[PDB]
């Protein structure tokens, strides 16, 4: 029927209420305030979605024991209806054939309509799904892909239960017995001036 | 108009539809029924959101081919709403700062403002990605890390085709041959009392 | 109100305005269009999660600066309330028990309420969470599985910055040394006819 702009004094997070106080001068009190105030959410059996409603944000409020229904506008006296901005959005916020989530355009989940889905944050730090790949992208440096039934990482350092590989590709156990530097002692020998190579290990 | 405290008998999970039967007294009948009675879905062109209504499940319904329309509220003759239980929630399931994925306090997808992203169950398995880094939770005992363009994994024997990394970082390929174990046939020499040490690999 | 079927001529997708065009002939025009009409989106904060409506598109308008409110329906002179395809649902798009993002029958997310989390496509491609594993799926011939405190990779190379394990577990660093078909080099001994075998590296 009739409405306000309204700022959220308060929230209550389990109740799905919020206290409310109009931004205007209405119509004696001048900026009325509206208590236990109900807003949709979204879900449906046992699963739901979340969204970080806080004392701060702006709406607008319309009207004329223990919940809770999904859909509280026009069949309660009164609901509260969150106005985000969303002007601003770049194609990463909203797209024409991707769904995305997204939070405060820092994290993201985007799902494509052909195949190809993305877990990301504005820092770089992603994790990736195409038709054919996995691949996990750390922005300092490494990157590790699923691909063709092969696995690979390159980047720095590889770190194994104390096992470490360099950037360039060479290996020591924890014990620092390197694969490419290690030698063996050799008993019972006459020792001479000659030099003979040994076989393949046993 | 008016509305009712109901009961889901069944679902058809292709017409997006419910079988209700009141839960109260109404007003000859007692229980009425309500048939191909419609809902509520999160959707948009080729995307959607869909949440697990079942039967058994309480709600309210509200009145006075092909679908099928995503808000059937006030231009249906009738319509179903879940009245979904949120009293007890915990910061998990609810929060002031996080979008929050999440089915029967079971599972969770969170994203935060600041860059955190965590994929999880109740059991602590855990995928997580923080401005500067991933990680992997293994609640058994194991965890993969991507951070500073280097990879760690810390926990129990790792295995690659066949080729083992004990917890301690000690390596055995699937031959059996290991790292730091392994010793090498040496040919054509004179059986002496001496010993010398072999330079590194060839 | 009153409602007509509609096609979505153009989206702005700053807005969250569309362009529409009546399907079918009106009561002077025949086939109206309608300007700047907004339609629901869901969030509340600093979050928000984005559906792919687009040009193309079908659904249906209601009637009788910057934003944005997330319903706008009944408080605008008119909205857009998309008409999407559902009664083709497979137990993918639409279940019981599964909380489930998806788009276009090509990507999906599914949490169910036990403690399984599923990430993947319909190429197979699969990041899978349940109460004591995760595990990454490639289509190709991959399998990484963190699970009892251990991680394990079975399908075809792996390679870390160079260094090569093959499928059947066999590994040589980027060098090209090989811990089962290395050799050392001895120096200092008499050639003779005997063959003595050294003792582990050092
Ligand atoms: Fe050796
Ligand atoms: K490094
Ligand atoms: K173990
Ligand atoms: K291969």
């Not at 208590?35 to 009207?63: E, Y």
């Not at 799902?111 to 889905?117: A, K, R, S």
């Not at 992208?137 to 590989?165: C, E, S, W």
């Amino acid at each position: 029927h009739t409405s306000l702009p309204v700022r959220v004094i308060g929230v209550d997070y389990g109740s799905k209420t919020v206290t409310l106080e109009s931004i205007v001068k209405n119509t004696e009190i001048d900026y009325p305030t509206f208590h236990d105030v109900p807003f949709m959410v979204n879900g449906g059996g046992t699963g739901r979605i979340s969204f970080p409603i806080k004392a701060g944000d702006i709406g607008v409020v319309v009207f004329s024991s223990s919940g809770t229904l999904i859909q509280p506008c026009g069949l309660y006296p009164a609901c509260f209806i969150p106005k985000i901005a969303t002007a601003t959005d770049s194609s990463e916020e909203v797209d024409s054939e991707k769904v995305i989530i997204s939070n405060n355009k820092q994290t993201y989940a985007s799902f494509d309509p052909n195949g190809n889905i993305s877990v990301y944050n504005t820092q770089g730090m992603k994790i990736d799904m195409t038709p054919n790949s996995i691949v996990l992208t750390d922005a300092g440096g490494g990157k590790l892909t699923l691909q063709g039934g092969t696995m690979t990482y390159k980047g720095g350092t590889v770190n194994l239960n104390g096992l470490t590989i360099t950037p360039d590709g060479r290996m020591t156990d924890s014990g620092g017995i390197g694969l490419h530097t290690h030698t063996h002692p050799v008993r019972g020998v006459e020792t001479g001036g000659s030099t003979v190579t040994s076989d393949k290990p046993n």
